[PDB]
Design a protein around this nucleic acid. Structure first.
Lengths: 255, 292
RNA sequence: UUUAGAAGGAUUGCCGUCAGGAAAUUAGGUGCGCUUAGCAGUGUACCGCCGGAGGCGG
């Protein structure tokens, strides 16, 4: 075919990152699209031409590593540090930095467009989803990889959508006051990270991961989001995240 | 101005049948002698060693049709039904259906299974204090309906007039005499004790449930779509569903629901066969309502 | 090609002693359940016969 939709159903991830400098919780959206782009790059070296241009994120259960106190607050845990490269590397006790970890069960909805979208493509995805990670976390098991046609085959769960209107339209002098007041009015919204902004100009520095590409120093940007059930969803395009790149801005938006 | 059937419409039965009680007798002394016939404990039932006849007794009460509506939540639809029944009482005085009922009495269909292998069967019908000349019951067939006997006409006229107003009630009593022979099984009815074949007992003796005797006398329908292929009378049911041949014989446009919708909710003259089926369904009774 | 890539929290323990819940009460008047109906796959699987398991007569 050409266009199509593939479901990755009930994926268990253990130990994914949950810290983005102001937020402890759901991982950033860039990692969830990075899983899809890594799946595309490994499928295109096995000579199965495909292109993923949209991801849907459905949440079925979660757990945060730690415990909940009597007062109702969350205290997080960390693994014991081992040996970290640097000056104090031959010592027996290392240092403790800032970290958080989460466990998730999720289902992914991928929009693929290639020369052939059949069940052999689903088998090729099944033989490739056992070498990748999701957000720095290992994949323990999955149920099935299948093709969907309509909005009645999608299992029960809750999707994550972008709500930027409820932020730009609230009361306050600055954006952080807008976020705090918008979270006090509606109590079903969460703050999320949605990409990066630029702090420098494109060039070549010294000390890069890949020394033959273009670099730019960046800072993360944050927004608002909320949850909507599968049975109350209108279209299958109002839950699909995509990459968008302006000049100086690296974003993920549903639009 | 009628758009649909009411939210509550029900009828009652205009042919009420009692339950049967089984007796044993001899044959050349049948008009002077009777004995109990009991169940022998699976259960079973057999005659004695000195009797060769099974006597089955039951009675019927006939009621008018117009005064047999139990509920109608819309006066207009009641006025429509009463006018349509008055139209049929103008054409046919309920004689065809009643002739068919007395024919099903005379063929002795009410002796299901008890009829194979009999040697002489006779059936006497009494109305008030006058006995009617008996019936040979093996000179009749279960495919044809005789219309030129004298006593069958003379009973069906009385039943007719009372289905149509001129009399308020009719009490009919029927006795039968089946000669199967000494030490032969009986075959009475069966109870859903819901193991073993638990047989029905009525006042100590044995008998048939009144519903089986009623379902034998309502097999008068020979006006269905595919009658030329399968040529046999069926019971008068709604979505016609003779249980032996497990296929609905009227699933569609000739069903009672559609046919009465196309006679009251939108005036349209049905053929006489369809009227003869609808006025029957009304003689039987049911919860002919709707889910508005 | 994912704020990428890495990680042993662990050993030990005496919560205890005492005690009056208690006095008072008005749940009450009404009422249509009700049309229809067939319980069984045959009502059981019996005597023998060959023949070292598999067969055949009535």
């Amino acid at each position: 075919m050409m266009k199509g939709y593939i479901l990755l159903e009930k994926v268990n991830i253990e130990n994914a990152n949950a810290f983005n400098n102001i937020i402890v919780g759901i991982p950033a959206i860039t990692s969830f699209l990075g899983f899809a782009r890594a799946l595309e790059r490994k499928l295109n070296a096995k000579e199965i031409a495909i292109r993923i241009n949209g991801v849907g994120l459905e949440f079925h259960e979660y757990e945060l590593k730690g415990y909940k106190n009597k007062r109702g607050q969350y205290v997080t845990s960390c693994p014991l540090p081992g040996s970290i490269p640097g000056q104090n590397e031959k010592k027996l006790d290392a240092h403790i930095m800032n970290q958080a970890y989460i466990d998730l069960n999720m289902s992914f909805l991928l929009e693929v467009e290639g020369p052939h979208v059949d069940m052999s493509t689903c088998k090729s995805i099944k033989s490739t989803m056992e070498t990748l990670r999701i957000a720095g976390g290992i994949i323990r098991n999955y149920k099935k990889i299948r093709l969907i046609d309509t909005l009645a085959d999608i299992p029960y769960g809750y999707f994550l959508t972008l709500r930027q209107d409820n932020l730009n339209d609230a009361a306050g002098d600055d954006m952080l006051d807008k976020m705090i007041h918008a979270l006090q009015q509606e109590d079903t919204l969460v703050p999320i990270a949605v990409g990066f902004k630029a702090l420098s100009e494109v060039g070549h520095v010294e000390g890069q991961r890949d020394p033959e590409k273009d670099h730019c120093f960046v800072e993360s940007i944050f927004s608002l989001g909320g949850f909507e059930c599968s049975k109350i969803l209108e279209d299958i395009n109002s839950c699909l995240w995509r990459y968008k790149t302006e000049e100086g801005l690296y974003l993920c938006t549903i639009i | 101005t009628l758009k649909s059937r009411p939210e509550n419409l029900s009828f009652a039965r205009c042919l009420n049948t009692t339950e049967a009680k089984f007796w044993q007798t001899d044959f050349l002394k049948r008009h002077t002698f009777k004995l109990p016939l009991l169940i022998t404990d699976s259960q079973s039932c057999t005659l004695s060693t000195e009797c060769d006849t099974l006597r089955i007794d039951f009675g019927i009460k006939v009621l008018p049709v117009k005064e047999s509506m139990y509920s109608c939540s819309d006066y207009n639809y009641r006025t429509a039904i009463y006018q349509k029944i008055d139209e049929y009482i103008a054409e046919d005085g309920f004689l065809t259906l009643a002739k068919r009922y007395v024919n099903n009495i005379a063929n002795a269909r009410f002796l299901w299974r008890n009829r194979k292998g009999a040697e002489i069967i006779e059936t006497i019908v009494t109305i008030e204090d006058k006995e009617y000349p008996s019936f040979n019951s093996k000179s009749f067939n279960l495919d044809t309906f005789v219309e030129d006997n004298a006593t069958i006409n003379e009973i069906a006229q009385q039943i007719a007039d009372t289905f149509a107003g001129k009399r308020e009630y009719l009490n009919i009593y029927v006795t039968c005499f089946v000669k199967i022979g000494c030490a032969m099984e009986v075959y009475p009815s069966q109870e859903m004790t819901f193991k073993g074949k638990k047989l029905f007992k009525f006042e100590g003796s044995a008998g048939m449930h009144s519903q089986k005797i009623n379902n034998a006398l309502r097999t008068i329908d020979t006006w269905y779509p595919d009658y030329t292929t399968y040529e046999f009378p069926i019971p008068v049911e709604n979505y016609g569903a003779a249980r032996s041949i497990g296929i609905p014989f009227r699933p569609d446009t000739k069903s009672f629901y559609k046919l009465i919708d196309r006679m009251i909710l939108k005036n349209e003259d049905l053929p006489i066969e369809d009227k003869h089926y609808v006025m029957a369904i009304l003689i039987r009774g049911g919860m002919f309502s709707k889910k508005q």
